[PDB]
Amino acid sequence: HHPCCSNPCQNRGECMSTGFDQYKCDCTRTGFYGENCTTPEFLTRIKLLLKPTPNTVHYILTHFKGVWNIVNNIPFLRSLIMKYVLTSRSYLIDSPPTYNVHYGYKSWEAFSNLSYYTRALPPVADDCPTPMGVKGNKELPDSKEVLEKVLLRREFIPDPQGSNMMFAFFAQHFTHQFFKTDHKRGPGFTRGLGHGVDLNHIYGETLDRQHKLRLFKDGKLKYQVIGGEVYPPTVKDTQVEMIYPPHIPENLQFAVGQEVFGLVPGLMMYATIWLREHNRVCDILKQEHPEWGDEQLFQTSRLILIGETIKIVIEDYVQHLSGYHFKLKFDPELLFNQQFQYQNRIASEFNTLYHWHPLLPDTFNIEDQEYSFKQFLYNNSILLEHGLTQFVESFTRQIAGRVAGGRNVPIAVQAVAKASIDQSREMKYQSLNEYRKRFSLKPYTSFEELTGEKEMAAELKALYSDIDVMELYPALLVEKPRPDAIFGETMVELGAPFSLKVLMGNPICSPQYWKPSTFGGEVGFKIINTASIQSLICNNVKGCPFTSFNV
Amino acid sequence: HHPCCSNPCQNRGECMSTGFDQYKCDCTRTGFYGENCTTPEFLTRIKLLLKPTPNTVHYILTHFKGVWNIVNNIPFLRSLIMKYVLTSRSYLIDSPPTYNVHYGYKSWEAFSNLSYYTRALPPVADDCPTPMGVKGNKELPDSKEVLEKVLLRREFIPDPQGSNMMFAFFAQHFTHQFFKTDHKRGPGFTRGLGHGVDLNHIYGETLDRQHKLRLFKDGKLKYQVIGGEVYPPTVKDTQVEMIYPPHIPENLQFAVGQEVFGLVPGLMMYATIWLREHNRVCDILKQEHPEWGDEQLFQTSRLILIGETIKIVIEDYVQHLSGYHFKLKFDPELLFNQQFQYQNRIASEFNTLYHWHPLLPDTFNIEDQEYSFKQFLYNNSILLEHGLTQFVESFTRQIAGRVAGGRNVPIAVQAVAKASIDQSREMKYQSLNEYRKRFSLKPYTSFEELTGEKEMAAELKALYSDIDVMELYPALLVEKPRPDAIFGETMVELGAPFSLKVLMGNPICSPQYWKPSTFGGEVGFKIINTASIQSLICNNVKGCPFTSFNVQ
């Protein structure tokens, strides 16, 4: 078997076979040396002595509200701390990217082929004696048993952070532009070749699909008007392919950028909002530039909406998630004197960790009605009956489920959660503790340490035997959460650096793009820099209802 | 017409219309402000005082040979100088890229669509009253008149820097991996979707093509043996599509990564050498890793060959072109403490400036024979007849043509030169003086200043009228060369930053790639770090004939 199966190289040293049963570690720029890259250089000893743990940093950011209250209102200081927040994560992501499902060593194929998700950790080699390398039993526990014992919801567990359905559907809508698995190829492949925030979920992945969705007047997207309200156009009108069951009526076959978005009325709610926003921005730019044609209006509006998205994701979405008293800021300028790569490749593990199905409620509560999953799925007549205003009011008020802490995946999506485990295995993911080490975290020494709890820990010990073969995905959903928080340590520490890259590693954040002229002048630029989840709804939803990501 | 037609914004300020009749300049981070970004900030004044001209720096670098001799032998000073050479060029190239033939403004389409060549300057808008914007006559001079008067070879003008045919064909072979115009789409479109040094010209652009070229044993590429010599395999054998005239016999239809390489025996020479080199590196890796499979052997050899290519281009190829006494150095580590984007998009203007057709001789002199263009083209029999040893020996000895200085385009390729002019116009290129300013050069104030001479300048004056509408491509070929040099100032000042980006922007130069383990350990890493044009020939050509890029 492959001599690197045990993952002998530590501290991000790279393992290479040197014969049939010998390995060498490449410790270049790790700050360590020796056979396994475990002897620290003098400077590295000093660095390690002083470095505070993630949990300590979290505590500081979630306390001393008085101090942060001052920090937030002193612009120079807010900038200083945001600048640090951005650059502290920076070293953790390989960019240019490296491994993928088929390549556990660097290759031109892995670098150049955009159809793959990239990999934060190489796959376990094919001939390793054990699923995780050399540790644990001959096979991992039955995935159905893991699912049923520690993942499935008994009673609904609400998010103590107060995340609502507006938040849950925004997460789904936003991430599904870059997590778009190519199932005809396999779980390690993506259909999102842009690898980030390009808004293909609004405009289409291909030029052909974009042209079918566009009006070709005033830069606008096509739309229909039903009961005086603007919605996306039909499949019949646009000839845009969408996924719908056979029974869905013609006018309810909405055509939008992302082909799966007719599945959930929550997704169609945001699809409709963003379409209206694009056309709203077209109206503004046409006012600013009566000389511009349709093409420039369309392209400039798209850049502006990409900006709005990044702005909202940092200052509202991530802000909500963080639980910090410090106000996060979207400001590309903070990176202009720093080393940073304006590019991104979507990692498979970033997709995996974002399978936040415990967010989903037992029912979807709009106005007076409480819809089951069966009633809610593929049913856009619900969107039309209640209207967008009521959707916003209802979903703002409805609480989402806690993600970490165990036993909160609703049974209606049990097949999705099992698939997450099965596909992880199929893609030969290394263990939880390897991912923890990869992201500068201390490996868990027991199952009770992981869960902070006794009962689930015991079920997991009987299933997995060794803590060093616990799998990544189920661990994120059973993990001991931060105090009164939606996530545990592992979710945030992996999720944060992937998020920074997908947001800031957009070309619009680069110095040659981050200019007023890029967005049609100061008027366009200001739309980006004042965007919020509240203004998105206020500008595009009748009655301007109050909204936020918290109940 | 478009309010920005006159290119009013200076110093890399961006122009946008603000109504039918009005424009606004975006002066962000230019160091200038005002209506046209021409009023310098105080720090910019100080910078513009202590900034030497390109001609001054070229003079320093090509003189004081005794000082450079010492400097070259102090590894610390050499690293320092090379770090400066790298970083001084840096700021001139938009990365991530911006404009293309269809987008004179930044757009997601222009950023994301890899089928386009990018543009260092946006195209002149379609409704502009004049081809160059507002200056000059309603129509540019007839390109045939420009070609015949100032570009066509009367007698052969040898390169005073001593460039040989090894250099000329290396330039053609190397560059045609990333200059690969998509003629079905148009001159502003490319088939090189990798936008750089990926060696698709050896391995194929697509996975399907690559697999048909591969042996699937020991990481190797398929080959054939003719009279005991290793050549690329045939089209019949591989089923790999190649461009050949119908009269070419099946046995002479060589199949390589790049579709067009069968058309010049000088290209097939380098194709054969690199194929051999790949298989040589496979043998070395197999010896180091008896545990490795075919797939890893092939991939790791490809990465080593990419490293070798960049190494040779910097330390032999650019070294020669430069005429510098300072020894340039390939060392990705020099950039690890600097701001630099490990990515590249090929600019249309980089393709245009690289149309070095004056390099070509009147005849191709191999051994005792002098082959005409008609005789040399599509004729791989010449390669088989003479062999690689004699190709290398003959091409090392044969001088190439001077590129700058005028009237040196071979008549046999006149249609190609005219095409360069015509396609520039079709792609709506801005003027020579706009490109000079874009790259921090003083605009020329007359045709005589451009050429350094009187007779061609007068021809150009009567053709174009105004120096500010002189076109980029013919200007490159008539420009006054640096003393005893192959090129003038514009070629080098545009060419150098583009070359830095295509060489250093490659992912293999990034911190996470630039490690021994990427290349199969220390032995693989060392192949890259000791590669040269001479070692490439020595390892892969029978007899190890002496070679270099100059005649001497």
Ligand code: COH
């Ligand atoms: C971020 C939170 C989130 C939410 C709230 C959410 C809400 C819901 C929801 C009800 C509203 C339903 C019925 C589902 C059902 C599914 N989800 Co999500 N999903 C979410 C995150 C994801 C992600 C990420 C993927 C992977 C996408 C991919 O790889 O293509 C996913 C994949 C799926 C898949 C398989 C993808 C495929 O094969 O096409 C199904 C089925 N699901 N989910």
Ligand code: COH
């Ligand atoms: C760099 C030096 C160099 C050399 C030595 C060289 C040597 C030779 C050569 C040798 C006998 C022949 C027969 C040709 C002939 C041609 N060359 Co070059 N070429 C060179 C650089 C280029 C470049 C760059 C292009 C554009 C390639 C593209 O965009 O596809 C080119 C294009 C061409 C074309 C297509 C022109 C068009 O209509 O657009 C022909 C034909 N040629 N060239």
Ligand SMILES: *[C@@H]1O[C@H](CO)[C@@H](O[C@@H]2O[C@H](CO)[C@@H](O[C@H]3O[C@H](CO)[C@@H](O)[C@H](O)[C@@H]3O)[C@H](O)[C@H]2NC(C)=O)[C@H](O)[C@H]1NC(C)=O
């Ligand atoms: C990126 O990587 C993908 C995975 O390797 C690759 O998809 C694969 O492509 C190969 C060759 O194109 C397909 O093989 C097919 O074609 C050959 C040639 O005739 C046949 O011998 C095979 O039987 C088969 O039909 C694979 O099927 C395919 N693998 C998939 C779909 O998972 C992509 O081509 C790569 N993308 C790029 C742009 O290079």
Ligand SMILES: *[C@@H]1O[C@@H](CO)[C@@H](O[C@@H]2O[C@H](CO)[C@@H](O)[C@H](O)[C@H]2NC(C)=O)[C@H](O)[C@H]1NC(C)=O
């Ligand atoms: C802005 O830059 C240019 C715009 O091209 C300049 O406008 C020109 O000024 C020329 C000489 O001063 C005149 O020939 C002409 O009046 C004018 N050209 C056009 C087309 O209007 C402006 O002077 C300059 N403004 C500033 C503030 O320097």
Ligand SMILES: *[C@@H]1O[C@H](CO)[C@@H](O[C@@H]2O[C@H](CO)[C@@H](O)[C@H](O)[C@H]2NC(C)=O)[C@H](O)[C@H]1NC(C)=O
């Ligand atoms: C990149 O841009 C080119 C040019 O617009 C695209 O090619 C066109 O695609 C359209 C729409 O599908 C076709 O109708 C035309 O045949 C193409 N025009 C040409 C060849 O000039 C190309 O599709 C784009 N690439 C991507 C990935 O979107």
Ligand SMILES: *[C@@H]1O[C@H](CO)[C@@H](O[C@H]2O[C@H](CO)[C@@H](O)[C@H](O)[C@H]2NC(C)=O)[C@H](O)[C@H]1NC(C)=O
């Ligand atoms: C590097 O790691 C290897 C492999 O893990 C180490 O080998 C040993 O590790 C422990 C050392 O006390 C032993 O308990 C293991 O049995 C043994 N494992 C194997 C496979 O040999 C090796 O000691 C490490 N080297 C250094 C310098 O620490």
Ligand SMILES: CCCCC/C=C\C/C=C\C/C=C\C/C=C\CCCC(=O)O
């Ligand atoms: C779009 C993905 C957002 C969620 C990612 C998954 C889990 C939680 C990650 C981040 C939220 C909590 C803390 C991160 C806060 C600051 C660091 C990242 C800043 C940024 O990112 O600029």
Ligand SMILES: CCCCC/C=C\C/C=C\C/C=C\C/C=C\CCCC(=O)O
């Ligand atoms: C890709 C190779 C292209 C060759 C260059 C093209 C045109 C002339 C430009 C440079 C050759 C002459 C001098 C080079 C001087 C400095 C460049 C060093 C940076 C680099 O380039 O490392």
Ligand SMILES: CCCCCCCCO[C@@H]1O[C@H](CO)[C@@H](O)[C@H](O)[C@H]1O
């Ligand atoms: C929707 C939940 C159905 C789970 C069915 C499988 C039950 C086996 O799982 C068991 O569930 C018990 C009930 O919570 C727990 O107390 C045990 O620890 C657990 O092992």
Ligand SMILES: *[C@@H]1O[C@H](CO)[C@@H](O)[C@H](O)[C@H]1NC(C)=O
């Ligand atoms: C769809 O929603 C409507 C309410 O708008 C509801 O009455 C109906 O039962 C739903 N359809 C299905 C098939 O569940």
Ligand SMILES: *[C@@H]1O[C@H](CO)[C@@H](O)[C@H](O)[C@H]1NC(C)=O
């Ligand atoms: C091809 O090359 C041979 C030399 O090997 C030469 O004799 C012959 O004339 C050439 N063919 C053509 C088409 O000129």
